[PDB]
Amino acid sequence: TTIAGVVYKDGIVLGADTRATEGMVVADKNCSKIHFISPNIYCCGAGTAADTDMTTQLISSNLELHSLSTGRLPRVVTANRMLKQMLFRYQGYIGAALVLGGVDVTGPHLYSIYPHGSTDKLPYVTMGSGSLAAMAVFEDKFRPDMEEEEAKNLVSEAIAAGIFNDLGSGSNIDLCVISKNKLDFLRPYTVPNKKGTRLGRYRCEKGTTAVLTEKITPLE
Amino acid sequence: SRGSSAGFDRHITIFSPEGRLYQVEYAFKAINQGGLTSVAVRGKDCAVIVTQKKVPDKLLDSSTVTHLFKITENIGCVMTGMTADSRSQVQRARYEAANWKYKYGYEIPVDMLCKRIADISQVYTQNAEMRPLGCCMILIGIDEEQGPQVYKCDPAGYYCGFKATAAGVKQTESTSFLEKKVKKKFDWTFEQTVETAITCLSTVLSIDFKPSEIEVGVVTVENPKFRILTEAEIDAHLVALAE
Amino acid sequence: SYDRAITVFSPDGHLFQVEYAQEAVKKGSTAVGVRGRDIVVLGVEKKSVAKLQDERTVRKICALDDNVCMAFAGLTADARIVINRARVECQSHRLTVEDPVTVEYITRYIASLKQRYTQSNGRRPFGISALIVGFDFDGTPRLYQTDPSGTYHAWKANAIGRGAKSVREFLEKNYTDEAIETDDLTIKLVIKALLEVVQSGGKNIELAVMRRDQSLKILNPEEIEKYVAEIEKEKEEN
Amino acid sequence: SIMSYNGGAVMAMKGKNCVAIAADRRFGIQAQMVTTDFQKIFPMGDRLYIGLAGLATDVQTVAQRLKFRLNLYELKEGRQIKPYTLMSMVANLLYEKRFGPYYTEPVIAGLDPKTFKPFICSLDLIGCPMVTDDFVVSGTCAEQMYGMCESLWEPNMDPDHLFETISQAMLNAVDRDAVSGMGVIVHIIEKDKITTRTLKARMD
Amino acid sequence: TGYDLSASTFSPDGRVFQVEYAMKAVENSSTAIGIRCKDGVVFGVEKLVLSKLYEEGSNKRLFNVDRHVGMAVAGLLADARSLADIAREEASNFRSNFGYNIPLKHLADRVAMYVHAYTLYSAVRPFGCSFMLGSYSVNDGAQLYMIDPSGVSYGYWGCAIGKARQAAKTEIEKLQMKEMTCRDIVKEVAKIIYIVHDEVKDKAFELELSWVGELTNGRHEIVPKDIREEAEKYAKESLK
Amino acid sequence: YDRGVNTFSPEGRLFQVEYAIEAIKLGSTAIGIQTSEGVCLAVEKRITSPLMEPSSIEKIVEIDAHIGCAMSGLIADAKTLIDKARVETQNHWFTYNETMTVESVTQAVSNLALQFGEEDADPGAMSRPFGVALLFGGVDEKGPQLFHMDPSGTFVQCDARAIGSASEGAQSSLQEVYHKSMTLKEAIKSSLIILKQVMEEKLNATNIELATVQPGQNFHMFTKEELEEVIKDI
Amino acid sequence: SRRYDSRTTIFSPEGRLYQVEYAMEAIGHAGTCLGILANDGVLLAAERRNIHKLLDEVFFSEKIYKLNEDMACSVAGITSDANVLTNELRLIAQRYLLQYQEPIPCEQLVTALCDIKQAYTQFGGKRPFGVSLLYIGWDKHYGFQLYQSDPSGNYGGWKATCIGNNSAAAVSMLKQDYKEGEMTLKSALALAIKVLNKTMDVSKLSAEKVEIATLTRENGKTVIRVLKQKEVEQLIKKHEEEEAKAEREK
Amino acid sequence: ERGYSFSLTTFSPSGKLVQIEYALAAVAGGAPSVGIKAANGVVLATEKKQKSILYDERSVHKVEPITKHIGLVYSGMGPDYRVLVHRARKLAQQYYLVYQEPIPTAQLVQRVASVMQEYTQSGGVRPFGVSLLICGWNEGRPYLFQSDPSGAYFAWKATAMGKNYVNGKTFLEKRYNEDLELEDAIHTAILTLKESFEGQMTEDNIEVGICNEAGFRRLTPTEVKDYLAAIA
């Protein structure tokens, strides 16, 4: 529930947390909140995770069809416009707040998309429940035309702040960098949180539990 | 003299014994029925469509019979065959281009527009309940990363990219002129391209046309919006080619 | 979307499609139906016995309810769909009335279906003539015959399909009030009527009988054999 | 509360290369228990089981429709279902009812048809894919089951230890829950066999 | 057969004989002429008097499709009425969707596209009517577009549709109509229509004449009666 | 095939409707007589074989308690129109608390008539015209009435009309023996004797269906005993 | 459209239906299919015509498909019609399975297919599916049971039947050499090999020219096994040996 | 738009779809194409003979991909090929959306066959005048499918559609090996193409796509002419 994106001197850097939770308890620590769309387009989704996943899959399929028909690389602008029109057709009932980053023929682009269908092109965008911490980190340590490492560190710090100041994000950070030339998608970018081992290991063997019936049906 | 017909093979577009579609191939000569020849060429950085303007009578407003249509700002087109069919295809192309612009956020590439128009023409060819729009459209534009582009659809629908081609009664003669010109000269500038475009019509049809007897459209990489030449530019190019 | 008028009035107002459906009915298998004073009997020629064949699936006599049954003559597939639609109509009537179905009402709505197909767009009528046997509430035997033209009429006895005219003209002279008093005489009458049609006599023939609301059953092959022997006994003494 | 209307508890973890999936057996209305022999784990393949939790009617309907489309696919295609494909297909099935969602949170467990690599995943009422290597749980017992698993689960487990761990997990997660339990069914999918067992749980 | 039975098929050469028969059906009808000038567009249409029991102004071939657009028709008059209804429907739609009166150029383009749309399918037949639309605007001036039954719309300094269309065109060529005065052009239209009318071919006849232009405050209207008798007298004198 | 369902003749009429009229003369003979004391309808059954039950062979149908109808032609096609007429009469009663007038029933039947085509309306519609001529006998506020419904939709109010196989000639003879001041008994006697004379076969109670509508009584169909009572004098 | 319609969904002056007659004739010159019943199973023999060496032949079976868990089919005629028919049959069989939680009876599924085929012949204006279908299966009510259906919509239940070229000769061979009620799987298989060798005498019995399928009931489970190429070679060898033995004894 | 509800394709008295035979004749009269299988991939080759060089042969493409792992070529009419490939692309995208896994080539060919059958048995429509050679890779295996205008399909190790197609098939049979490599497959395909090119093939006139475990990819004229030089 903490995703962010930024444009640096070369292209786009996208980042996301991994604490996918339903209700109030953590359901997963390895959510894939940075969806692939095109070899030059990625999008980070927040909110109803199923809706975000279906939206990203549909956009990826539509841009696959478009690019393969036109013989050109997919555009961030066409993806953004399709997202806007579809979400607006559903009047925001698709609980998906998206950060669409990518590099196209006209240059790197970053867009903030709201579930009601509103979109905006901004150099740095944060979204999710923990969006405010990452937004503050960006407003504090953002510069125009930053280097690759500076952008990566800034996004990492923003995700770390969102993780440590929100109760719906953590346990990993995901990064994806898109440029004019190279696309990198490093999922376990940095694991700022570890787990201590169980001090007293407690294990059981057969005969510790009570079983009523056994049924073996060997397969081949 | 015993004008027999083979049922409906020669009457509606169904598969003929010779593996042909008779009403599809009638459209090729339906292009000729218009009696007008349109030839288009592209330079290294420009694309020029030159078309003779027919004036069967002074009593009609010849300033309003211009057959060059701007599909978008940067896409111009000209058609051959039935003029009503030409207007319908121009309207459909404008609709599709605008729809692509809204649905995809940027101007439609000329190749994709030609592909969509060709698919619509194939919709007519496939169906056996509609006239297969016996009209041929040729369109121009300026494309990034690829340069000036000229595309041409057809009632059959088989389109292709090309340096230069023509549609009309004397499209074969214009094709021959294009063959001889491409085998003679290769390097083309803007003025050479426009001079060759005028020379194609002049050599093929041999009319010594007046300045008002043609309508010419150009797309250049200085203001990629499709612009139509007026009488001043027509006379300038005429005298330049003459000298 | 398919709405081409198939059934149209030819010159002199003759429905040539109806005539062709009648031709298909005539070329179809032979079926007969008698309405005895106590029972109703249907007899179908199982022509081309074609051994190694499960005759259960090709049985042309199908029961619609506990008191209604029909035997067709014509197209087997149109017969099957009409039997399905008649099962639908009988069940719908039983639901909406919670009373036992009426043979005449069933035949009437089948005739209405046939007339709708004659009057419809893009459709052709059902090339089958149906003999509907059954019993009313009071146990009154009912025998009706409907044709692809849509007309249905009640008959004391009749025949449909191949040789239908010959069989019905034989029955109209062989039918007497005292000849259908008991099940034995009715079965013998139907068997001697179909004997002129079926070459085998006993093995290329199938008989079904319905009593007054008594769970109609199909006649056993041994019963058919012994009753053909009985009619031969009558023949030798007469 | 609609998913707790009937109650439920389903889990699935991974072994060294085998899989354990277990579920409660109690079926009844919010108040009374009707049947204690209800089946909640259904075979979507020879080496692939699926557990469903939530509204019992939605469980049964989703299972029937899933078996419908799965059988159609496998008859059209000629290969046993791949677990990832089954999970994606059921997730799509749940998403098709975005405005009419089935109040069910299912889990899918099994082995790769050719690799026999363990696979487990979970969904929600909309059908959100959730692939977690260690374990996935669903139902009204969610908190108890998560707490049990996050300490009882270890990587690279033999089938017998895997069964012991999952059996203890279900037993100790349903005995502290009121709308689930009354018998636990456990399926252990090993490389070349499956073992189906009923635990000696408290029936009340 | 096969090449002239429907508008959805080409001739072996690629012709549309149904549209050619529609052209025949619009040619054999009565004459209808439209002249545009620098300050107005006039229409003079020829009415066949089947019997004197008819009213003057009955079965008008002049329709008023927009607040400023007229329509002079020839061919099947019921088809002409239907096309006038379609034209006024299109004008109403444009006014509703854009808040101002439709320009004549786009009106004619849309109507011609509609006409051509019913020349493509075997489920319909091409219209048996040709029609000229005249309008005026403060920024555009006087405009006149003629539309064929095929669906082709062109601007005409002056056009004629009917039997004597070519004769009317040829004799009126002496007029430099592109910078003339609407009032006198009405009289010249009366003249040309009287000469091109064949009294022997049609003994009984009537004229329906109208203009639209700057003198009309940019709204289509019929000729006032007094100008009608004066133009009729001028035409009688020009008959010589 | 080739010719459509909406095709006229060179002289300007539907030859399909002409074929329908030809089928009308192919139909069974029916007779209707209207008098001041009611209206009578009769029809010949045309029994094919004695095995056919006379009960199911009835060409006279009740539209309402005050309306009877005689059909000639495609008797299978006539029952749908009869059901439509009855449901329309009952709708009129349900709406206006009165019995529907016979003339309005005939007009509505004409509205249903000649409504068919290939692609002209909803696909679930008629393809061919009704091939049945109808005689609507009835009693209403305008006294006894009788209407000849032609399949063309050209409905007619006629005092007496004979239709079917022996329509013409028999209708002229009926007119000659018909008067403007005949009683109901005279009407039934005349209709019965004309039908007996025009019978193609020896008629009896099992060869004819008779019905009447009276100003006081409802629509009553003559049973066998009264049929024999009225036919023995003729 | 009156002149240019094909009006394939109307009657004929003599009462027949030309479209179904032509479909049956085309099926007659189409591939060979044979179905037989044994006391412990039912066997199918399907003949593949296009046997070019360029075939990948990776499929388990070409004209033999599996309608549902306990019923198999053999198609005769247009293979694309066959594919669309087969997946429609699978769809409706699984529909019955969903609706009743019981394997769909073979008679039920055959009746449904014949209903839809008859309706498609009845109207729609389209050319009928010119494919004959031969269904085998096992059910609670009749167990092993096989049907032959026709493009006209008519079906019949048989102990054994064949479709394709020399259909009359094949059915004569069945009527001569089929032991009703006493046909084991081995003797049924031998009779099937005999038919495959005889009803298509041109291009005499070849392993790759035909495909063999069996359907049995083991432990209350319907097992559909497609005999492999080595199995078909074993059948060919057994047929050659038995024919040689019969001729030598003759 | 009304739409004819009567199928233009009808059963002849002999039962042969003579209309489909004419469609196949149009396929034969169209430009030829070949497809071939290797032990570890599929190669599709075809020729694009335009008119005189005024056509920009580079601008248009004939080999088309459906997915990253599926490509195809056609013999016949380009207008039909465009709509058919576009519909196949839609079907593959829909399958990927539903099942989150790449389309198997067999299932895609089955869907295309169903589309062709619907076209042939429906009303108001002309049968497709193309034959598709479809290459695909899935589950670490190669697949090459012939799909005819009749709507049927086959898995063919080698095929040749168009003019001289029977001779091309025989030539492939003579020069086909069961365990050849992709290099041998390219050699055989180019050899067949030059044996049936009729007019001195050129790197521009030959367009080739290769499908293997790395996916499907179309060879650019550089390596195209490189392989033609290596093959002679």
CATH number at residue E86: 3.60.20.10
Of H139, G129, H136, residue with least CA distance to H147: H136
Of C129, C152, C133, C155, residue with least CA distance to C67: C133
CATH topology of domain F2-234: Glutamine Phosphoribosylpyrophosphate, subunit 1, domain 1 (3.60.20)
D179 SS3 class: coil
Is residue A25 one of the residues assigned to a domain? Answer: yes
- F75: phi then psi, degrees, rounded to nearest 5: -55, -30
- A27: phi then psi, degrees, rounded to nearest 5: -95, -35
Query: How far is the C-alpha of A62 from the C-alpha of D103, rounded, in Å?
Result: 30
CB D91 within 8 A of CB D128: yes
Q: What angle do CA A81, A86, A91 make, to 5 degrees?
A: 120
- Side-chain half-sphere of A39: how many Cα atoms within 13 Å? 9
- G186: phi then psi, degrees, rounded to nearest 5: -70, -50
Technique of determination: cryo-EM
Token pair for E211: 């203009």
Q: Give the neighbor-by-neighbor strand order of the sheet with B227-229.
A: B164-167, B38-42, B46-52, B214-220, B227-229
- Side-chain half-sphere of F78: how many Cα atoms within 13 Å? 29
Query: How far is the C-alpha of A117 from the C-alpha of A97, rounded, in Å?
Result: 9
Chain E closest CA to B101's CA: distance in Å? 21
**H or E stretch at E168:** helix E165-172
Q: Resolution of the coordinates in A?
A: 3.6
Strand partners for D111: D118
D60 reaches A (C-beta below 8 A): no
CB H126 within 8 A of CB A106: no
CB D9 within 8 A of CB D147: no
The CATH number of residue A140's host domain is 3.60.20.10
E strand segments, A56-106: 96-104
Strand partners for E44: E33, E209
Distance in angstroms between the alpha carbons of the first and the last residue of chain E? 50
Report DSSP letters for D68-128, one per residue: HHHHHHHHHH-SPPPHHHHHHHHHHHHHTTTTS--SB--EEEEE-TTT--EEEEE--SS--
- Side-chain half-sphere of H185: how many Cα atoms within 13 Å? 27
Of F176, F183, F191, residue with least CA distance to F231: F191
C176 SS3 class: coil
List residues of chain G with CB under 8 Å from any CB of chain F: 2-3, 7
Report DSSP letters for H136-151, one per residue: EEETTEEEEEEE-TTS
Query: How far is the C-alpha of D27 from the C-alpha of B184, rounded, in Å?
Result: 89
Of D54, D6, D11, residue with least CA distance to D149: D11
CB B170 within 8 A of CB B205: yes
C171 SS3 class: helix
- E143: phi then psi, degrees, rounded to nearest 5: -130, 145
Query: How far is the C-alpha of F232 from the C-alpha of D120, rounded, in Å?
Result: 96
Strand partners for E212: E41
- G133: phi then psi, degrees, rounded to nearest 5: -120, 140
Tell which CATH architecture fits domain G1-248: 4-Layer Sandwich (3.60)
Q: What is the DSSP letter of C146?
A: E
Chain H closest CA to A93's CA: distance in Å? 20
Q: What is the DSSP letter of H84?
A: H
Compare CB distances from D130 to A23, A27, A211 and report the shortest one's residue: A27
User: Residue ranges of the domains in chain F?
Assistant: 2-234
Compare CB distances from H99 to D76, D88, D129 and report the shortest one's residue: D88
- Cα distances from G171 to residues C56, C186, E97, G23, H46, in angstroms, run 19, 37, 75, 20, 49
Query: How far is the C-alpha of B41 from the C-alpha of C91, rounded, in Å?
Result: 76
- G93: phi then psi, degrees, rounded to nearest 5: -65, -45
F119 reaches G (C-beta below 8 A): no
**H or E stretch at C128:** strand C128-135
**H or E stretch at A79:** helix A76-89
Query: How far is the C-alpha of E165 from the C-alpha of E193, rounded, in Å?
Result: 10
- Side-chain half-sphere of F180: how many Cα atoms within 13 Å? 0
- B interface test, pick of A38, A64, A68, A72 with most B CB neighbours within 10 Å: A72
What is the 3-class SS of chain G, one letter each residue? CCCCCCCCCCCCCCCCCHHHHHHHHHHHHCCCEEEEEECCEEEEEEECCCCCCCECCCCCCCCEEEEECCEEEEEEECHHHHHHHHHHHHHHHHHHHHHHCCCCCHHHHHHHHHHHHHHHHHCCCCCCCCEEEEEEECCCCCCCEEEEECCCCCEEEECEEEECCCHHHHHHHHHHHCCCCCCCHHHHHHHHHHHHHHCCCCCCCCCCCEEEEEEEEECCEEEEEECCHHHHHHHHHHHHHHHHHHHHHC
Compare CB distances from C53 to G9, G145, G156 and report the shortest one's residue: G156
- Cα distances from A171 to residues A164, B44, F70, in angstroms, run 10, 57, 90
Query: How far is the C-alpha of E185 from the C-alpha of H33, rounded, in Å?
Result: 69
Tokens 């009156």, residue? G2
Of G73, G63, G85, G81, residue with least CA distance to G35: G73
Tokens 């091309």, residue? H168
Query: How far is the C-alpha of E77 from the C-alpha of E85, rounded, in Å?
Result: 12
Token pair for A23: 């209700």
Domain limits for position A16: 2-190
Is residue A209 one of the residues assigned to a domain? Answer: no
Pairing relation of β-strands C128-135 and C141-146? Answer: antiparallel
CB C122 within 8 A of CB G9: yes
After what residues is chain D interrupted, C–N > 2.5 A? none
Question: How many structural domains is chain A composed of?
Answer: 1
For B1-243, CATH gives 3.60.20.10
Question: How many structural domains is chain E composed of?
Answer: 1
Query: How far is the C-alpha of B131 from the C-alpha of F100, rounded, in Å?
Result: 53
Which chain G residues have a beta carbon less than 8 Å from that of D71? 68-69, 90, 94, 97
Query: How far is the C-alpha of E162 from the C-alpha of E45, rounded, in Å?
Result: 10
- H interface test, pick of D86, D89, D95, D114 with most H CB neighbours within 10 Å: D89
User: Residue ranges of the domains in chain B?
Assistant: 1-243
Give the rounded distance of the alpha carbon of C133 from its chain centre: 7
F158 SS3 class: coil
Domains of chain H: 2-231 (3.60.20.10)
G11 reaches C (C-beta below 8 A): yes
Q: Give the neighbor-by-neighbor strand order of the sheet with E40-48.
A: E158-161, E32-37, E40-48, E205-212, E221-222
Of B115, B127, B122, B114, residue with least CA distance to B155: B122
B15 reaches G (C-beta below 8 A): no
Query: How far is the C-alpha of H134 from the C-alpha of H218, rounded, in Å?
Result: 13
**H or E stretch at D14:** strand D9-14
- Cα distances from G75 to residues A158, B59, G69, G110, G194, in angstroms, run 64, 71, 18, 13, 21
Helical segments of chain C, H only: 16-27, 76-97, 103-119, 164-174, 183-195, 221-237
Helical segments of C100-148, H only: 103-119
CB H1 within 8 A of CB E121: yes
Q: What is the DSSP letter of A135?
A: H
Token pair for H152: 């049927």
Query: How far is the C-alpha of B241 from the C-alpha of C7, rounded, in Å?
Result: 72
Query: How far is the C-alpha of C164 from the C-alpha of E186, rounded, in Å?
Result: 85
Domain limits for position E176: 1-238
Token pair for D117: 């690599």
Query: How far is the C-alpha of A122 from the C-alpha of A115, rounded, in Å?
Result: 17
Compare CB distances from A28 to D132, D167, D197 and report the shortest one's residue: D132
A35 SS3 class: strand
Give the rounded distance of the alpha carbon of G225 from its chain centre: 15
Is residue A197 one of the residues assigned to a domain? Answer: no
Chain H closest CA to B40's CA: distance in Å? 11
Q: What is the DSSP letter of B170?
A: T
Inspect the structure and tell me whether chains E and C have 3 or more CB pairs less than 8 Å apart: no
- Cβ partners under 8 Å of residue B108, min gap 6: B72, B75, B96, B97, B100, B101
Query: How far is the C-alpha of B160 from the C-alpha of B147, rounded, in Å?
Result: 16
A contact chains, 3+ CB pairs < 8 A: B, D, H
Beta-carbon contacts below 8 Å between B and H: 104
Domains of chain C: 1-238 (3.60.20.10)
Chain A closest CA to D178's CA: distance in Å? 20
Chain B closest CA to G6's CA: distance in Å? 11
Token pair for B100: 């692509």
Give the rounded distance of the alpha carbon of E235 from its chain centre: 20
Compare CB distances from C151 to F51, F75, F124 and report the shortest one's residue: F75
Of D65, D71, D56, D46, residue with least CA distance to D7: D56
CB G128 within 8 A of CB G116: no
Tokens 């009304």, residue? H2
Q: Is A119 a residue of the active site?
A: no
Q: What angle do CA A151, A157, A162 make, to 5 degrees?
A: 125
- Cα distances from A12 to residues A5, A151, A186, C53, E175, in angstroms, run 7, 9, 14, 74, 71
**H or E stretch at C68:** strand C68-74
Contact B161 H55 (CB under 8 A): yes
CB G197 within 8 A of CB G207: no
Of H88, H39, D200, residue with least CA distance to A68: H88
Angle between helices D56-77 and G79-100 (to 10 degrees): 160
Interface of E with B in 56-115 (CB under 8 A): 105, 109, 112-113, 115
F47 reaches C (C-beta below 8 A): no
Report DSSP letters for E91-157, one per residue: HHHHHHHHSSPPPHHHHHHHHHHHHHHTTSBTTS---SEEEEEEEEETTTEEEEEEE-TTS-EEEBS
Report the phi/psi class of residue H162: left, alpha or beta, with left for phi > 0 and alpha for psi in -120 to 50: left
Of A45, A118, A43, A34, residue with least CA distance to A76: A43
CB H45 within 8 A of CB H51: no
